[PDB]
Design a protein around this nucleic acid. Structure first.
Lengths: 150, 129, 143
RNA sequence: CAAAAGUUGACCGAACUUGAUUAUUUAGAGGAAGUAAAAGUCGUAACAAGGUUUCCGUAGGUGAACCUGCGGAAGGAUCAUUA
RNA sequence: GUAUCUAGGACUACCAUGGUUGCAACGGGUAACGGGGAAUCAGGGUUCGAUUCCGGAGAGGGAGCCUGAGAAACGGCUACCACAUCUAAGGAAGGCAGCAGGCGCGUAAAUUACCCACUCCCAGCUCGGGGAGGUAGUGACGAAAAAUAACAAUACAGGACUCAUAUCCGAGGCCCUGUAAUUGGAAUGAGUACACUUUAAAUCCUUUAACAAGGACCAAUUGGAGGGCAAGUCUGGUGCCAGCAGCCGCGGUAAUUCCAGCUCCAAUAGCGUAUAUUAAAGUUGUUGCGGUUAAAACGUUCGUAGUUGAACUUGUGCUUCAUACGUAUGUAAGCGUAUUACCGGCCGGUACUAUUACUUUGAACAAAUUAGAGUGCUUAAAGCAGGCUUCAAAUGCCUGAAUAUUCUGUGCAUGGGAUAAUGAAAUAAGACCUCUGUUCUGCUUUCAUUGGUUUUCAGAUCAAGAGGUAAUGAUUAAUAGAAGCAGUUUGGGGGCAUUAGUAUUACGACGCGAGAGGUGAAAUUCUUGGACCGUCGUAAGACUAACUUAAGCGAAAGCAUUUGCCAAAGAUGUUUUCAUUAAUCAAGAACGAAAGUUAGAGGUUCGAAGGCGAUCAGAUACCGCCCUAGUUCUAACCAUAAACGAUGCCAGCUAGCAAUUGGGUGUAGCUACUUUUAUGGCUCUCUCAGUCGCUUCCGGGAAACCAAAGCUUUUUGGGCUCCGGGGGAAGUAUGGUUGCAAAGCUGAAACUUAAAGGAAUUGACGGAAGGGCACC
């Protein structure tokens, strides 16, 4: 229940039942493989391909209209990110609080936060090594981490 | 985290038996749950229960009758041979007359009064009386 | 709540009890075993001793009397004892600095009655069995 | 031919002087505590608004209990209206 | 390599840098020989095992070694040490933890007896030897069996009884019951001893001729009589003495406890006392404790070890018979098919197989013990014997000497696939049963014997095709979690910049006068012409009122002027993404009010200490004045608090009602005017995330109470961690470790003691409110 900060809330997205539907959707499985390649070449994450394939185009769920996921599409077209998106924004957050602090010292909250967000890294840098999506000998260092955002 | 998923159907049946409800909405429907209530259904301690399906985990709406008192769940699943199966029927079962200890033997989930007939031993699941 | 209720936690369950039977006040004479340290005899049942005095231990409040005890030095270890002689008279059976078989006092280490902190009891003085002396069921050794 | 006493050297190595350390027991001027505790002297700190509400953390001070400062708490003497 | 019987760092030589541990290595302790087993309860268990059987060690200490098949032997030797002996003084010799003894030690342990007859061992051996073994004396460790009377009229009363008569009453009373140093009748064996038997011999028991009870004799005790706890308000003595007493308590001059006497009770050849141990003890708790207030939730969160982790992946059908009784259903097979390649007559034998955990059935392994069926040792504890027309001949076969559990546990077989982990096909294996090779590695048979030359065969393995039909291969997206997002936000959340506000002190001036401050009352203290007051003005440091809440935010500590910036965050919105990434956590890590410390600034008010003034019997206090460290800002240290919700954390459930902060949503609402509008406000409706109150359990609790302190049920089970075990001593002593230090974390025991404590009732219309009286 919010694993590092003790609010207990629930919100989410709720998928509906009928996995097959819609039938009226004029967009087929072929062109979204192009359109993900069209949008993913602009360097967007699999999430922000989804919420723009959803609103504008607009397909409800890409797993339904195509027998893969949005990430698993992007690997099959050679658009693989070197670091996955969850470890990215948790690194990219962790490098901001490590940049705010080197100027603004004396802030115990951003010291305590960066403990709470470097701890989420080393547990998700640890799951990504057993499933071997990222290689072994992979310790996120807090020094060289600035270079792996831009 | 939701550790034991058998257990809190049995604390939703027993909890909603005490206040005397007639229908009970479990979540999220193990196939050890349905094997358990069917053991409770051959003895009539439960109504006919319907499994309202999702593509997530399952949800059961159970009909209650009002014949039972307590369905519990022996966590962890202690390994119960046939020889120490009698030890538990003193403890969990309130009389030599009635009551049941559901256990998973390898030949399918049965209560003790079947496994002491089919000469099977297994691990314990729960009980009811 | 509390216990490590898994099925593979019998290591925690035995290392917990091992570490928490020390707080069982009476199972700290299995563990620390102070018998050879604080008992006046080194863990035995009885003790032969040699009387040194005749101590008139006065009674504790709210009972007034004077208990007429006896301060023994043993022969076992050279500890010191204040023992006790019961059942009125029988200080007249002491014949001082002659040997005594003191014994435990039946509350397993504490003084019992109105006696303050005296933990023992004479059972034989000069080998003639004091309970066989109030009747004088056997003869007192006098010469 | 064989072979004793003797003998050279490696080895096993008692034992004893030392040096150490370990585990125990113990002596001691003085000092400073605890308990017995009943009857001593002085005060009256706490329990009632115990006559300065009581306690907590810390810090200084005082014959003694204790007193004072800063921040807590109610286990308070207020579950609080009263526009 | 050497050595050994042999492996081996066993040892040497060179060379490698390894091994081990929070799943407890290493060191320490042991009043430690290990096991069989013993003690004790319903289970679960604690405790014990020096001791007869098995394994191991040792013969005063350590070391050494000969003979041997076997000994690092000690009823072999060799030293040395210790202890000790005979010595004519030169020398010589010692080893009971074998038996029986002796000294010691201690609370604590038998006779310097007999025998190889038994069991078996030994030699050359049928014979010899064997204080092994067996007999005996000693022997209330222990366990079993059982002697202290039995019977009879009167008896002396109770009672029925027949009956008079009945709130009475007696007699015919009597099955009875007792009392009867009344009367008896006396029934028998401890004695008792011929002789037997038993035995190596002898004794003991069993048989036994003779001998053996009116109690005084053949003569039971040991503890107690307030309660616990069975059983005298009996008499005398003693008077807080003597004593009793496990606990609670008796005795302080009429003792239901003391000293006795009478009585009485409990067990009884047994009983008391001590220490130990077990059960009582759900007071060590896995079953099974407790933690708001009784002892007990770390200040906070992070977090490895560890423990624990959602759902999903061959299930009932359909037909039959076996099968309970028209039916039922529990049956096996057919049939949504590796119900499996072959040969045999549905049938043997074969060819032929993802594990693990758990479970079924087996094997394997000494008895004794234990559980125990069999068996009249006179019964019994034991024992492993024993039965039997044989009645008049025995020939008279066998029951036997079971069977499972402590020989738990590991380990080994086999049945099962529920539960539970692991495992596949995504920088590549979908296959081909395969004529198969488009690799070549070959490999042995026939070339009688044997190969140079090479094919079949290619037993083969690995390339190998484009012999690629391939449904070709990727489970759901948890009201798990992390992540994203015109998002829309919201908040005393955090940091730094910016500024504001009155007020306080001070200082200036201007004016006015002499009193001003303070207290219950004073005084210390300030002030002549100018304090205090008024007034405008300057400088300062501190603090953020009113708004202000049962309002928000934060991990806890904590957090309020404006604004700019700065990274952060919960919630909601989400047909976005990832797909178990999770829970909780020893060690460890960060944060931590106040006080305090080190250095630097500042320094208004307040102000530990200090000094006064009072007050008081005293006052090192409260009250009053002066102020110093401190308070404040950056730099670090400290690491605690009633750090409190005296309530760890994650998850689900079990009820109303009222508010109430965010966000969402519908007005089939008003209202704003920019306009009927639209943004904004309000009201109504619904929903998340909640929070706070009440109402109640129709749940719990010792209660006060609690919507969790509930579902802790009836011996209960959602995970996980920390903690408590009568009160003191004592957060002390000592060791380690951290700190500049203050101190922090770890942390006892000797000793002491029976209560200490929790919650609630009733006692003060006894120094507290609110009432209400009267001339004690």
């Amino acid at each position: 229940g919010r694993m590092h900060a003790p609010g207990k809330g629930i919100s989410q997205s709720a998928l509906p039942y009928r996995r097959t539907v819609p039938s009226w959707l004029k967009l087929n499985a072929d062109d979204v493989k192009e359109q993900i390649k069209k949008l993913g070449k602009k360097g967007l994450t699999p999430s922000k391909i989804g919420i723009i394939l959803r609103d504008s185009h607009g397909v409800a769920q890409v797993r339904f209209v195509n027998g893969n996921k949005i990430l698993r599409i992007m690997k099959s077209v050679g658009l693989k990110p070197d670091i996955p998106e969850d470890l990215y924004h948790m690194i990219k957050k962790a490098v901001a609080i490590r940049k705010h602090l080197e100027r603004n010292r004396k802030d115990k909250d951003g010291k305590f936060r960066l403990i709470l967000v470097e701890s989420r890294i080393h547990r998700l840098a640890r799951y990504y090594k057993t499933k071997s999506v990222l290689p072994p000998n992979w310790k996120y260092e807090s020094s060289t981490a600035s270079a792996l955002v831009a | 985290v939701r550790m034991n998923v058998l257990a809190d159907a049995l604390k939703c049946i027993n909890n909603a038996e005490k206040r005397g409800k007639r229908q009970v909405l479990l979540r999220p429907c193990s196939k050890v749950i349905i094997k358990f209530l069917t053991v409770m259904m051959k003895h009539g301690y439960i109504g006919e229960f319907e499994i309202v399906d999702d593509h997530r985990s399952g949800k059961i709406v159970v009909n209650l009758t009002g014949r039972l008192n307590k369905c519990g769940v022996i966590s962890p699943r202690f390994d119960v041979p046939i020889n120490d199966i009698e030890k538990w029927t003193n403890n969990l079962l309130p009389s030599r007359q009635f009551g049941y200890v559901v256990l998973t033997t390898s030949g399918g989930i049965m209560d003790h009064e079947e496994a002491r007939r089919k000469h099977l031993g297994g691990k314990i699941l729960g009980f009811f009386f | 709540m509390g216990k490590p209720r898994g099925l593979r936690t019998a290591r925690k369950h035995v290392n917990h009890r091992r570490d928490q039977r020390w707080a069982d006040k009476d199972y700290k004479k299995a563990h620390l075993g102070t018998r050879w340290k604080a008992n006046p005899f080194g863990g035995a049942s009885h003790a032969k001793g040699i009387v040194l005095e005749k101590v008139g231990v006065e009674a504790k409040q709210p009972n007034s009397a004077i208990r007429k005890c006896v301060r023994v030095q043993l022969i076992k270890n050279g500890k010191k004892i204040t023992a006790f002689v019961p059942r009125d008279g029988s200080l007249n059976y002491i014949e001082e600095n002659d040997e005594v078989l003191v014994a435990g006092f039946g509350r397993k280490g504490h003084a019992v009655g109105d006696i303050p902190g005296v933990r023992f009891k004479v059972v034989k003085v000069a080998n003639v069995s004091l309970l066989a002396l109030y009747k004088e069921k056997k003869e007192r050794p006098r010469s």
